[PDB]
């Protein structure tokens, strides 16, 4: 009933776009934030034409690069000067740390090998490239950008919007994570130890794991030190984001703050429900689709 305002980052396509669609249709006013201005503008255009001209006021595009303090800073001023309030933050902007060399479809063989780690719990530490048709590349620079967006970007956007969110009588923060965040994949036992702590976990300790991983990664010691052979930066940053979700969950008890692993409209249903979470929903939990 009460008019609400939401930001969804990385929302010009994919699941984010569907999150935006579903929030706007429930009467929420959505800020569609995207790394590129025109794609965000075009995404807004398609949503109102799909939803109806009566939603033109309920969807707004604003450019947002989460790795860029000035982009983040510009967005807070925009929400401040146009609306004055914020009730929902959905952190969906994210990077893989990976690309495919050669046949792009071999990626499904790499992803397949990872999900069989779920049904055996035996996390292999030696790299195994399923085909010579394609190769899953994980460069040093992509690992920095991946960590910088998935961890530091989300924290930067979250901390910048907390002051506005705290004037909500129901602030909701939703962090879009990934199944690869599961600790079954953390072959490095120290890092797994840090991430698993429920008491005495600090952001400084999280940042030490990220910095330590990036340094063994520079040094070419990914395998020496038992770091994941594939999706390595991706797994560590999204696992870090899960742990960070719990940290700020405990800091702000009046908020409901959660992470969720997510066609795209159905996968968007789980994060959208958490953005409209009743005041009694949990806080600090990792949901796979539906719990």
Author numbering: 11 to 272, 287 to 315
What does the paper say about this structure?
Three salutaridine/menthone reductase like subfamilies of short‐chain dehydrogenases/reductases (SDRs)2 from Mentha piperita were identified, namely (−)‐menthone:(−)‐menthol reductase (MMR), (−)‐menthone:(+)‐neomenthol reductase (MNMR), and isopiperitenone reductase (IPR).1a,1b MMR and MNMR catalyze the ketoreduction of (−)‐menthone 1 a to (1R,2S,5R)‐menthol 2 a and (1S,2S,5R)‐neomenthol 2 b, respectively.1a Additionally, they act on isomenthone 1 b to produce (1R,2R,5R)‐neoisomenthol 2 c and (1R,2S,5S)‐isomenthol 2 d, respectively. Interestingly, the three Mentha SDRs have high protein‐sequence identities (63–68 %), so we performed comparative studies of MMR, MNMR, and IPR, to pinpoint the determinants of ketoreductase vs. ene‐reductase activity within SDRs. A key difference in the sequences between the ketoreductases and IPR was a substitution of the highly conserved catalytic Tyr residue for Glu (238 in IPR). We determined crystal structures of both MNMR and IPR, the latter in combination with NADP+, alkene 3 a, and β‐cyclocitral (non‐substrate).
The MNMR structure was solved by molecular replacement using IPR as the search model (resolution 2.3–2.7 Å), and was found to be structurally similar (rmsd 0.97 Å). Major structural differences were not observed between apoprotein and NADP+‐bound forms. Therefore the bulkier MNMR Tyr 244 likely positions substrates in a different conformation compared to that observed for 3 a in IPR because of the larger side‐chain bulk of tyrosine. This is consistent with the helix of the flap domain (MNMR) being shifted compared to that in IPR, to accommodate binding of 1 a,b. KGaABiotransformations with MMR and MNMR showed only ketoreduction products, with no detectable double bond reduction.1a,1b Reactions with 1 a and 1 b generated the menthol isomers 2 a–d (entries 7, 8, 10, and 11).
